[PDB]
Amino acid sequence: KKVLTLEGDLVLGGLFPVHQKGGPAEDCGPVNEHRGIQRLEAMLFALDRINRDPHLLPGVRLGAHILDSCSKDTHALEQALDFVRASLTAITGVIGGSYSDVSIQVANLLRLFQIPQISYASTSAKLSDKSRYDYFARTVPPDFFQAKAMAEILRFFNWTYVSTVASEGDYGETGIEAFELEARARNISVATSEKVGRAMSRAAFEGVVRALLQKPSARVAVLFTRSEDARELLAASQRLNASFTWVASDGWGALEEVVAGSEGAAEGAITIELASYPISDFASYFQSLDPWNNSRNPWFREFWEQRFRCSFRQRDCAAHSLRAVPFEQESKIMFVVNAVYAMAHALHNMHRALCPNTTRLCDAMRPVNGRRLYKDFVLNVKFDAPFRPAHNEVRFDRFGDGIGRYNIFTYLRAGSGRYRYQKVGYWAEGLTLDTSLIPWAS
Amino acid sequence: AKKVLTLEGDLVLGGLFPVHQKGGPAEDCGPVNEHRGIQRLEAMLFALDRINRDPHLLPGVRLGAHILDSCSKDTHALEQALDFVRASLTAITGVIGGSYSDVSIQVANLLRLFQIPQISYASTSAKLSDKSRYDYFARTVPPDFFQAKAMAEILRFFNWTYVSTVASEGDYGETGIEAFELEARARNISVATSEKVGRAMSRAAFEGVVRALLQKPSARVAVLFTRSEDARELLAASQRLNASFTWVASDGWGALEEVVAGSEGAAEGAITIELASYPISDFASYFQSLDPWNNSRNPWFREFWEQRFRCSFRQRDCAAHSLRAVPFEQESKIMFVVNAVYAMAHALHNMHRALCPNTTRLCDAMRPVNGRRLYKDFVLNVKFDAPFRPADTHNEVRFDRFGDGIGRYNIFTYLRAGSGRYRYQKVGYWAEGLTLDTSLIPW
């Protein structure tokens, strides 16, 4: 498989779902544009800015070794061998992965070589356990909080009889387990609990929907699903003409790919995303990307062909521009940039203590000690989030986690007939909803 | 800790045993583990000696060992298991173990990256049957769907319809109880409460579990899918709180003495399960003849001796003891250990017969052994009479399509015998249907 490599004095590993999961034979399927390509390019954008920052590692260039997880933990683990083979390349730290199952599988390999790891999207509560994930940190909070936010949405609307659907794996199952605990504490009962396996068919999704219809009093379906599972569930529901009030986690969030083609089935859905903002300079950087000037990204030409349904062989790709089309910044881009900066700040603070007389890598950091870097620097960073709007701070808590803050969205059909996500609320140690923005709310 | 049991050979087999219990929050390794630790490790060494003398099983190919200690911890086991792959980055042809499902899964994730076949003698988690994830794993034991079905059938037989469940956190406990619950539901069995035992539970936290179970006085039956230490500590807490429960426990508790020792009263009337087996021949004699001077090959034996006879070698006079003098109860899964080692030798033998026909020695075609072909073409197709089987038995060793063993279990009850001593009695079995006889059950 191909790899993205950038030269530096210290090299940061990267892990992203550049491609979707493949079919029954192949590990890798189509290019994953939003949570794959954009997130990868956000890490490249962050590295470029750090490398030109006079106040952050002025004498230490940050390189990269970025791998594709193909949205599959076993494939991510096979790729993750490149990070450790230079110990039986030299990787100082790893940024990634996205999926909780990928981050857990990778963390269990990285800790064996004391490589620090910072995830920008893995929300599984299991990852908060430092006796098991002692080299793991994340810029995102655990789903202990997300599950409360979802139980409280149901409690506010008095939805006391609901069904649940969880993605098989750490994320979905432990997320739904936390949701169900939090719902029972607020006297919300569960009609049925469905599961979506890691290799389900389109007909098997229709089975899930039929199973949810077997309890007609439960109109509210609570999802702790991966985007693809939310997408297929919704497509199955459109096909069987089933109507549900969806309440879904960040896996769905405010992704257009989830609802595209099943807008009618999704209408009225309440979704959650981790509280974030779009990073302004990232948008001009991404929209400038060009298949002729972006050779450092080995998956960019395959992304271009898919996005613009063109062929470089057929010479019909140049007519397209990311400048000439609309740009929707993926919700967790801020978390990617914060993870790269958190690692850069940690190495900078380590450099200040270990190399006081030079801006260059002194012998004390040849090589970088993984234990010290994680325990005494990564966990202790505290800085103002870069490219933030006119206020956020990057830091890790005692479990190496981010802050439990969430945005609440609703999926609606506007007066024009066009569909959109609309921010209707917020959760941060308590629920705040603006019912005037929810079309079906009284 | 960092001791490794090494034995030279033409082909080296990796080994993995919980030679020590898990330590406290500051140490990876705790006290030496006699029954599921020392005895199983010794059973592998016993099998290797007997294979290495056998003229019909690899006559010109000596099998070596690289045996590691998991310390009953999946993170520790995996740090140790790097030894198995550091060459492929001495060469390891296949691996025997581990015991705990979480250990076996963690190691299988690593070994498959290097196409290293693995055979467990005790990990029963259904997750391990998934060949999209554990394509180099096989086992001499069945997956826990069968154990969980057997448990739901035991309840249904006695009309125990409102019950409680206790699971050790992880892929053995949680998935075992989850399977049990689906089988119990279909048999009109309800669940009062479901408790989880965390990996770092305190004496107070176990008492909290007992009180959580007491909050439902209608449910006197508690179904356990727990690791032996969790069951030991839950019984200890029940004894402390004068709590009375009808225990229905998986192989984790099984027929272990250590689980019941000191909590006999809280344990009395327990229905426990173990995988169907027999004590093997020659091993009882092999184990009892072990001394701190002849057994230098096992670096953990002196520490086992010190624990067993409650003495110290530094202070001396530990020597004036013998395993022959003390009684010997062969650990229930010793047969699975020997079967796993023999399964690998037979797969290696059959591969040798096909790829090296012109010599009894290791030819080029097996220099190195191709792990993918070893697993797919030979390990999955082994079929042989179980070594050291008892008189007038037709036990065979084989694997199904997915590398799993056959769902056959023995059912036990924990009772006070006529001599006043507390003990486990065989009162039934499950092999595609429940057979138990009420007569041997005192209640």
Ligand SMILES: N[C@@]1(C(=O)O)CC[C@H]2[C@H](C(=O)O)[C@H]21
């Ligand atoms: N929070 C998730 C997880 O697996 O931990 C759910 C699905 C996938 C989300 C994302 O990449 O934005 C990440």
Ligand SMILES: N[C@@]1(C(=O)O)CC[C@H]2[C@H](C(=O)O)[C@H]21
């Ligand atoms: N069957 C178990 C498992 O973890 O899969 C339960 C606890 C431990 C048992 C044993 O070593 O005898 C093994």
Ligand SMILES: [Cl-]
């Ligand atoms: Cl990923």
Ligand SMILES: [Cl-]
């Ligand atoms: Cl083990």
Ligand SMILES: [Cl-]
């Ligand atoms: Cl245990």
